[PDB]
Amino acid sequence: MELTAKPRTPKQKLDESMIAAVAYNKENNVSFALDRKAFDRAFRQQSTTGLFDITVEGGETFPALVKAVQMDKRKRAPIHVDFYMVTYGEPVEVSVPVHTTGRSQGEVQGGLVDIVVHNLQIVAPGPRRIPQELVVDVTKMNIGDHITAGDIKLPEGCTLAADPELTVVSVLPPR
Amino acid sequence: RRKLRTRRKVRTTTAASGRLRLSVYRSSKHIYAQIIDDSRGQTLAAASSAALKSGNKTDTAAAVGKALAAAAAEKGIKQVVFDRGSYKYHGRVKALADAAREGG
Amino acid sequence: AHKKGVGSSKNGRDSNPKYLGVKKFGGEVVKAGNILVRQRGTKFKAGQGVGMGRDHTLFALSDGKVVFINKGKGARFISIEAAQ
Amino acid sequence: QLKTKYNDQVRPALMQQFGYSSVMAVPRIEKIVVNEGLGSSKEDSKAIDKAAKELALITLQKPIITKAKKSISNFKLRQGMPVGIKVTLRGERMYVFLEKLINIGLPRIRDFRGINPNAFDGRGNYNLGIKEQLIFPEITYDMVDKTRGMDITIVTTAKTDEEARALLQSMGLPFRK
Amino acid sequence: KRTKFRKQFRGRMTGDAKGGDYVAFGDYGLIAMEPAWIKSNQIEACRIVMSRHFRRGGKIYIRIFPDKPVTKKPAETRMGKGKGAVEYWVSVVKPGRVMFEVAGVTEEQAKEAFRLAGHKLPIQTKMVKREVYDEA
RNA sequence: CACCCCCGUGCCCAUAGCACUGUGGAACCACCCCACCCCAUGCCGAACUGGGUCGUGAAACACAGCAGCGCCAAUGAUACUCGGACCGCAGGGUCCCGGAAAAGUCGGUCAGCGCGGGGGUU
RNA sequence: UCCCAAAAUGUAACGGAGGCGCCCAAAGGUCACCUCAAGACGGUUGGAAAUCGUCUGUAGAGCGCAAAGGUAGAAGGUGG
Ligand SMILES: [Mg+2]
Ligand SMILES: [Mg+2]
Ligand SMILES: [Mg+2]
């Protein structure tokens, strides 16, 4: 992502395919303005558990994580973004997606397994090695099987910010 | 509880009064018969019973009232006002009062 | 007679003339007697030098300049930092 | 007439059972009460008297008519109207009547066997729910009106119920084991 | 459909969506692209339609309840006051909003569960999927 | 304002509140003790109140740590809008120009500032 | 008295809701004091609420009636 400008005036882009963000930490809170498409093809994967090279026009590579993007209504199109410069030993806390795997003993059974909570935020991730996903069991689950955060295995170190007993998923019944 | 001190205090008008207020912390036997000037968070006199007492404390009663009334003299105060506390103007406190309420 | 309801319920006729507000604003050389605020409960609380009528009205006892003070909302006051 | 073994049997034995940094910080007893939530089901401008007259000779204290919280729920309820009766006891009269109970009260109870264990005011405070008034060293049916009951409150500095019980028992109290 | 209890009447005005997230409760979802008044009975028209296409799972979310009473001509007159508290009930959808979002059925078994459901709405809508991560 | 701490009383009046934890005792404070009568609880000197130790610091308080919660709160982009000028039959909407939120995010703090009296620096 | 009413005031409709033609020797003057709703655990006729008790508890209560504003340092609750 080669964003270059960063003036308060976004004219020179609002037409020209280019999104407009801002990134910081507590130190520098530099103004920003990157390419629409690029970021558009970008953020997709890495989402918010994905840090990428930020060599602002002039050659000064930076590290940051996707904070908060506020896209257009009427148009799934995005307009503004927030990057939270990666730290080193602690970024803050992150939002990690819940994922199912292996056919469940509920699906075939007679019902369908539902993921009550899509993405999930956990206390402390640990910068340098931050889960860009989170596979989860479902098979065992049968006729009304709830799985909470205090169940899902954890990626060596990370601590669950979300209440444990909280239903992350549950096999839903028929009808 | 506290209410009592804030009612008593609040009821006592500040600068609309112009006058001055004399307090008292006689829930202890360490009264403080303090005198304060409305606006400025200043204290003009005072006449506790902290400088010894001889043995009295609930008795040093009118002592501190006396030790204050004549005390303002070396400042020269004429009009003052009693801002007691919870202390329901009984004897112990009436002491300081009458004592001073005449010694002034 | 008959056997119904005297008047037809659910109406919408009439209301009230009504007034109230703020008669004197920040920095107006009030006067002895000027009224500075018609309020209802105690929106603005009698500051320093501001007598307060029976209907929470607020007037000036002496002369001077009108002063507004609002601490974190809730409690507001109109004072009179007289000139002279 | 008490207090020494109060401390002694209780207090010391307490450090000699526990370990208190002071004698100040040891579970004690703040007040014993007698709630008389009678009437209502018996609106006897006459029956109300039985209680007081009574309570007072068995608690040696003129009680107050804890009039309805002005609550007027569906059934029989209304404004602030005489319903119950409160009589708080502390220190002296407390211990003075109290002792009666530890001594005569309960001991002298037909069908009596002891009192429930299970924690009450997790506040380290205990509760007592007496019924029939016919078991009092004062209660005289051959000089009363009809026959009633009553409830008593144990108010104790006890920080915990653990510390409560003991105090409660050593000080005088039977437990149905 | 209808609200359980309330006040009785109302007014009318507009400005685009404000609280119609995106993903939440599902993987697929429908969004309205025009300022309208969704008649409760035009919701049933969807729900039910949508049902049929599905058999079980019931992974259909209707996050657009009708908080709005409308009115009518008692027959003609004019000489009297406001009228017809009960013409029907409406739920004001605004652009970008999310009335629907099934979840669980095939991408396709989802693009039809709406197509139809869209043929009975006073406006134009398009389907949506993910990357929706604002508040959670 | 020599250094400190403590008690009273302010301004300020949650970025000064809470909680969890620890520090303090015989200078101050409080608990504590008795209390017939002064004066007193619509019952209880629990609270008012009168006369005082010891003992304790446990409770209350004062102090200090801490931020899990509260309270504060950016910037960037945005909602809206004065003004200018347009669109769609209509619901509605847009362009140029100044103003410009709310919520949320970075982060922020568990105050700061007086007067007077007390006791310490063996 | 609320809304309409377009953050000053004011503003219409056979527009949307609701009250008044009173009440209080004391529900007034002043002077003292107390402070609520509500839940949780534990308690006797009780057992849903209610009487007592113990925690939480800027008040989520109260204010003679309609609503709004206002109010606990009380306009709330008692006594002289
Ligand atoms: Mg302009
Ligand atoms: Mg314009
Ligand atoms: Mg603009």
- With residue B11 as reference, give the H or E element that holds it: helix B3-11
Q: Find how far residue B95's CA is from the centre of its chain.
A: 10
Q: For chain A, how many structural domains are there in total?
A: 2
Chain G positions within 7 A of any protein Cβ atom are 1-5, 8-11, 14-19, 32-35, 37-38, 41-55, 68-75
User: Is residue A47 domain-shared with residue A97, that is, in the same domain?
Assistant: no
Nearest nt (C1') to B92 (CA)?
A: F50
Regarding whether A96 and A49 lie in a shared domain, the answer is no
CB contact under 8 Å between A43 and E56, yes or no, is: no
Task: Tell me how far the alpha carbon of residue E95 lies from the centroid of ligand 1, in angstroms.
Answer: 29
Domain holding D146, by residue range, is: 1-177
**Domain, as residue range, for A25:** 1-86
Which own/partner pairs from B72-76 qualify as long-range (CB within 8 Å, at least 24 positions apart)?
A: B72/B35, B72/B44, B72/B45, B72/B104, B75/B44, B75/B45
**CA atoms of E60 and E44, how far apart (whole Å):** 12
Do the Cβ atoms of D103 and D97 come closer than 8 Å?
no
Are A6 and A67 in a shared domain?
yes
Establish if E104 touches chain A: CB-CB under 8 angstroms: yes
* CB atoms closer than 10 angstroms to residue B34: 18
Parallel/antiparallel/unpaired status of strands A65-66 and E98-100:
unpaired
Q: How many whole angstroms separate alpha carbon D6 and alpha carbon D3?
A: 4
B30 contacts: CB under 8 Å, gap ≥ 6: B48, B49, B50, B57
**Closest Cα in chain A to E96:** A74
User: Which nucleotide does the CA of A11 lie closest to, via C1'?
Assistant: F96
Give the angle subtended at the CA of A95 by the CAs of A92 and A96, to the nearest 5°.
Answer: 125
Residue C52 — left, alpha, or beta (φ > 0 → left; ψ -120 to 50 → alpha)? beta
Domain membership of residue E13 (yes or no) is: no
E131 in contact with A, Cβ within 8 Å: yes
Closest CA to B90 of B79, B98, B80, B102: B98
**E11 domain-assigned:** no
CATH number at residue E115: 3.90.1170.10
Tell me the sheet residues that pair with A136. Answer: A100
Structure tokens at E134: 């604002």
E12 occurs within a structural domain: no
Dihedral sign, CA of A101, A103, A104, A106?
Answer: positive
Domain shared by A124 and A57, yes or no: no
Contacts of E33 in chain A (CB under 8 A): 74
Kindly report the number of other CB atoms within 10 A of residue A1's CB atom. 20
Nearest residue to F47 (CA, C1')? B1
**Domain boundary assignment for chain B:** 11-104
What span, in angstroms and rounded, lies between the C-alpha atoms of A6 and A9?
8
At E58, list the tokens.
């019931």
Rounded to a whole number of angstroms, the distance from the CA of E18 to the nearest CA of chain A is 8
Query: Do A103 and A35 sit in the same domain of this protein?
Result: no
The answer for residues whose C-beta is within 8 angstroms of residue E42's C-beta and 6 or more apart is E120, E121, E122
Question: What's phi and psi for A111, nearest 5 deg?
Answer: -130, -170
Task: Determine, for residues A74 and E131 on separate chains, whether the beta-carbon distance falls below 8 Å.
Answer: no
Number of domains in chain E: 1
Q: What's at D124, amino acid-wise? A: G
Residues D167, D159: contact at Cβ < 8 Å? no
Rounded Cα distance between E97 and E108, Å, is 22
Strand G interface, D 1-30, C-beta < 7 A: none
Q: Among residues A57, A86, A115, which one ends one of the domains?
A: A86
What's the per-residue H, E or C state across chain C? Answer: CCCCCCCCCCCCCCCCCCCCCCCCCCCCCCCCCCEEECCCCCCCEECCCEECCCCCCEEECCCCCEEEEEECCCEEEEEECCCC
Give the number of C-alpha atoms closer than 13 A to the C-alpha of residue D146, restricted to the C-beta side: 11
Written as one letter, the residue type at D164 is A
| Strands, sheet with E125-128, edge to edge from the N-terminal-most edge strand | E98-100, E29-32, E125-128
Instruction: Please give the DSSP secondary-structure letter assigned to residue A109.
Output: T
Chain E nearest-CA distance from A56, in A, is 25
> Looking at the DSSP assignment, which residues form a beta bridge with residue B43?
B36
Asked if D112 and D106 count as a contact pair (C-beta separation under 8 A), the reply is: yes
Interface of E with A in 24-63 (CB under 8 A): 24, 33, 56-59
Under 8 Å CB-to-CB from E61, ≥6 apart: which residues?
E25, E26, E29, E100, E101, E102, E103
Check the CA dihedral A165-A166-A169-A174 and report its sign. positive
Nearest to E125 by CA among E84, E64, E66: E64
F49 closest protein residue (CA to C1'): B90
Using left for φ > 0, alpha for ψ between -120 and 50, and beta otherwise, residue D28 falls in beta
* Cα–Cα distance for residue pair A141/A147, rounded to 1 Å: 8
Pairing of strands A146-148, A167-172: antiparallel
How many angstroms is C1' of G33 away from CA of B88?
Answer: 10
- Helix, strand, or coil here: E89? strand
Q: Could you tell me the CA-to-CA distances from D74 to A13, A113, A152, D39 in Å, in that order? A: 71, 48, 52, 17
In SS3 terms, chain D reads as: CCCHHHHHHHHHHHHCCCCCCCCCCCCCEEEEECECCCCCCCCCCCHHHHHHHHHHHHCCCCCECCCCCCCCCCCCCCCCCCCCCECEECHHHHHHHHHHHHHHHCCCCCCCCCECCCCCCCCCCEEECCCCCCCCCCCCCCCCCCCCCCEEEEEECCCCHHHHHHHHHHCCCCECC
CA of residue B26 to C1' of nucleotide F50, angstroms: 13
Query: How many Å lie between the centroid of ligand 2 and the Cα of residue E131?
Result: 36
φ, ψ of residue D104 to 5 degrees: the values are: -100, -60
**Domain-embedded: residue E72:** yes
Rounded-to-integer distance, Cα C33 and Cα C47, Å = 15
CA of A5 to the centre of ligand 1 (A): 27
Residue D11 tokens read as 């207090």
Which residues from the 51-110 window of protein chain E have CB within 7 angstroms of nucleic acid chain G?
A: 79-82, 85
d(CA D84, CA B62): 47
Which residues from 1-20 of B have any strand G atom under 7 Å from their CB? 1, 3-4, 6-11
**Residues 6 or more apart in contact with residue D5 via CB below 8 angstroms:** none
A81 plus A91 within the same structural domain: no
Helices (H), E9-134: 40-53, 115-119
Last residue of a domain, one of A86, A104, A136: A86
Task: Tell me the residues of chain A between 61 and 90 that have a Cβ less than 8 Å away from chain E.
Answer: 68-70, 72-76
**Other CB atoms within 10 Å distance of the CB of residue C80:** 21
Q: Are E43 and E50 in contact (CB under 8 A)?
A: no
For strand G, list residues 32-91 of chain B whose Cβ lies within 7 Å of it. 86, 88
d(CA E115, CA E112): 4
What are the residues facing C68 on neighbouring strands? C78
Question: Is E83 inside a domain boundary?
Answer: yes
Asked whether the beta carbons of B91 and B62 are under 8 A apart, the reply is no
- Give how far Cα A175 sits from Cα of A103, A110, A115, A144, E56, Å: 20, 10, 17, 14, 4
Cα angle A166, A171, A173 (rounded to 5 degrees) comes to 130
- Residue B22's H or E segment, with its range, is strand B21-22
Please tell me which of the candidates E96, E104, E133 has its beta carbon nearest to residue A119.
E133
The answer to whether residue E134 neighbours chain A at the CB level (below 8 Å) is yes
Count CA within 13 A, CB hemisphere, residue D128. Answer: 24
Pull the structure tokens for residue D150: 């009553």
- Chain E within 8 Å of A167 (Cβ-Cβ)? no
Burial letters D45-57, b for 16+ CB under 10 A, else e: eeebebbbebbee
Sign of the CA dihedral running D89, D94, D96, D101: positive
* Residue B51 CB contacts under 8 Å (≥ 6 apart), including other chains: none
User: Using an 8 Å Cβ cutoff, are E84 and E72 in contact?
Assistant: yes
- The CATH number that applies at residue A125 is 2.170.120.20
In E, which residues are within 8 Å of A111 by CB distance? Answer: 56
CATH code for position A10: 2.40.240.10
Distance CA D88, CA D59 (A): 9
- Delimit the domains of chain C by residue range: 20-84
Q: Give the sign of the dihedral formed by CA D91, CA D92, CA D93, CA D98.
A: positive
Q: Which CATH number characterizes residue D2's domain?
A: 3.30.1440.10
Nucleotide whose C1' lies closest to the alpha carbon of residue D36: G51
Phi, psi of E40 (to 5 degrees): -45, -45
In which element (H, E) is residue B100 found?
helix B91-103
List gaps in chain C by the residue before each (C–N > 2.5 Å): none
Could you identify the residue written with the tokens 């209890």?
E5
Distance CA C62, CA C33 (A): 7
Following CA atoms C34, C39, C43, C44 in sequence, which dihedral angle do they give, to the nearest 10 degrees? Answer: 0
| Residue B62: exposure state from Cβ atoms within 10 A (0-12, 13-18, ≥19) | buried
CB of B86 closer than 8 Å to CB of B27: yes
- The span from the CA of E6 to the CA of E2, in Å, is 11
Give E5 to chain A, closest Cα distance, Å. 29
Name the experimental technique: X-ray
Assess if CATH 3.30.420.100 describes domain B11-104. yes
Neighbours of A133 (CB within 10 A): 13
Name the token pair of B43: 């204290």
The burial class, CB within 10 Å (0-12 / 13-18 / 19+), for B7 is exposed
Q: Which domain holds residue E59?
A: 18-136
Q: Taking Cα atoms as reference points, which of A77, A52, A49 lies closest to residue A63?
A: A52
The CA distance from D35 to E67, in Å, is: 51
E133–chain A Cβ distance below 8 A for any pair: yes
Where is the domain boundary, A66, A86, A106? Answer: A86
